[PDB]
């Protein structure tokens, strides 16, 4: 067995204790961290000092039983100490895992999820997942010989390994995939009011002032949708609404689609047809010239191509598929059933009806729902401190659940045994936990770094008067 | 008493 010196153990459990209730001590003093995520923190941090504290405690305790030589008292100190890791160890799981349903929220439904979870609905959930966990942790230690329980803390480890891993594609692999680029779809970028650029628009192609509906796309059967739309037409093409609308459909693709979409711009005179791809930066003016831009994929994973429309007052009419069906809502769109040629042309209607009021607080709503999408936003920020986070944790247990992988599949072979006997190594890293995770989270909160430069200042006082 | 669980 590695022996490690207890003066480490009770150092970095000191070090860890000062560290986590600065944490608490900052978040409870400021008012500017009253959130469901720093209240999660706050309880992240509870966990974090009662594992090394208790780890300290109990090398300090081992120390004294080593020079006075009852067995019972041992198995009770023993097993309140365990206890206490191990309810902690739960409690740290549960409230990294309820800051993930609080940022998944705050980016999907932030205006929702900000109703429900008030002041008071944070405390009932956090002391039931302490309830929970407490009562979890004694049990598990009374049957801390039982497969059943090592099998179940070793299931939960899994779990936060595969949500670290979800996380780490999500953010960082496809980052790029669903990010929104602010630097370029940007309105700075355009010119004049609106119907301004609408009615140059509409001239350069040759056409009357109307409602604008623009679709930019492949021209397949069974994903991008193109096929609706050119069917929803076919279908609004005998209504008198017909009249007030101008289409714009750009793509290129099956041959048969375009001969399509080139036989009704031919038969009606306000649908327009490009077949060729056109250049980012046209697609980005027609954004903010076009009043609607109508997205009916039948499968659509990123709602990236709804991000940039929002971005330039484009009022999305898409599928309520995949991506769309999280971006758009009520506020910032127009959903509709996928691959329903007569539903969709009722949300042209609807469209046409809606434009009869001001769209100016409409387009507002979108710029500003794709807005909160950007990678340097509160709510991204938020989801990349929660992969540090979690990251940080994988890594530090990730020692100490191979050696218990270890205990029940291989106790006896001679090298699981050699990984086994560096425990006390792990059990150092395990507490290297709760001194990483507030360091964490002061370079990535910029309130909580202010908090944390007001009480060295107090700290600072606290000794003038405290020796005067 | 062993530090922590499961070390033996
Ligand atoms: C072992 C049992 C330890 C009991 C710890 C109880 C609560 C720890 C979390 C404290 C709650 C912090 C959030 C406060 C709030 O939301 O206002
Ligand atoms: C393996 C763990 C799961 C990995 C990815 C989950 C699927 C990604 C989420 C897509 C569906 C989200 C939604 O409901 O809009
Ligand atoms: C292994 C692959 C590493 C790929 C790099 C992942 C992070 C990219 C940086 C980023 O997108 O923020
Ligand atoms: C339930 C817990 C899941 C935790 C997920 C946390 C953050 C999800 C971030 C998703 C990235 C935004 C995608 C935006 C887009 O689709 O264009
Ligand atoms: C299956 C087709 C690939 C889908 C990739 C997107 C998954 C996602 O949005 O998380
Ligand atoms: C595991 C959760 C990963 C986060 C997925 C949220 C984004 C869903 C999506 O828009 O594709
Ligand atoms: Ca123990």
């Not at chain 1, 429900?116 to 009932?124: E, L, P, W």
């Not at chain 1, 994929?297 to 009419?317: H, K, Q, R």
Request: proline share 3%.
């Amino acid at each position: 067995q590695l022996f490690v010196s207890p003066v480490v153990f009770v150092t970095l459990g000191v070090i860890s204790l000062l560290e986590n209730i600065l944490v608490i001590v900052a978040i409870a003093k400021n008012k500017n961290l009253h959130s469901p995520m720093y209240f999660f923190i706050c309880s992240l941090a509870v966990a974090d000092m009662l594992v090394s504290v208790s780890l300290g405690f109990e090398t300090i305790v081992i120390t004294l039983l080593n020079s006075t030589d009852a067995q019972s008292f041992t198995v009770n100190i023993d097993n309140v100490i365990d206890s206490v890791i191990c309810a902690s160890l739960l409690a740290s799981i549960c409230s990294l895992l309820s800051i993930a349903v609080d940022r998944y929220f705050t980016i999907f439904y932030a205006l929702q999820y900000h109703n429900i979870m008030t002041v008071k609905r944070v405390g009932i959930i956090i002391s039931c997942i302490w309830a929970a966990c407490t009562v979890s942790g004694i049990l598990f230690i009374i049957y801390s010989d039982s497969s059943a329980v090592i099998i179940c803390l070793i299931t939960m480890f899994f779990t936060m390994l595969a949500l670290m891993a979800s996380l780490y594609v999500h953010m960082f692999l496809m980052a790029r995939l669903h990010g929104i680029d602010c630097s370029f779809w940007n309105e700075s970028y355009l010119t004049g009011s609106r119907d301004e650029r609408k009615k140059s628009l509409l001239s350069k192609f040759g056409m009357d002032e109307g409602v604008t509906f623009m679709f930019i796309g492949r021209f397949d059967r069974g994903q991008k949708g193109v096929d609706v739309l050119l069917k929803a037409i076919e279908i609004l093409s005998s209504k008198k609404e017909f009249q007030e609308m101008r289409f714009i459909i750009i793509g290129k693709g099956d041959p048969e689609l375009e001969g399509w979409a080139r036989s009704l711009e031919e038969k009606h005179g306000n649908v327009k047809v490009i077949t060729e791809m056109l250049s980012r930066e046209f697609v980005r003016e027609l954004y903010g010239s076009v009043d609607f831009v109508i997205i009916p994929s039948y499968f659509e994973p990123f709602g990236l191509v709804a991000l940039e429309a929002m971005c330039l007052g484009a009022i999305p009419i898409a599928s309520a598929v995949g991506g769309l069906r999280d971006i758009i809502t009520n506020e910032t769109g127009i959903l509709v059933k996928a691959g329903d040629p007569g539903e969709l042309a009722n949300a042209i209607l609807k469209a046409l009806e809606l434009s009869r009021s001001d769209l100016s607080k409409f387009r507002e709503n979108c710029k500003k729902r794709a807005m909160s999408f950007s990678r340097q936003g509160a709510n991204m920020k938020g989801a990349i401190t929660l992969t540090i986070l979690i990251g940080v944790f994988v890594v530090c247990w990730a020692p100490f659940f191979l050696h218990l992988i270890f205990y029940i599949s291989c106790p006896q072979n001679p090298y699981c045994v050699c990984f086994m006997s560096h425990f006390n190594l792990y059990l150092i890293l395990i507490m290297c936990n709760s001194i990483i995770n507030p360091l964490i989270y002061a370079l990535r909160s910029q309130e909580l770094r202010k908090t944390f430069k007001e009480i060295i200042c107090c700290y600072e006082f606290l000794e003038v008067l405290f020796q005067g | 008493l062993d530090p922590x669980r499961w070390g033996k």
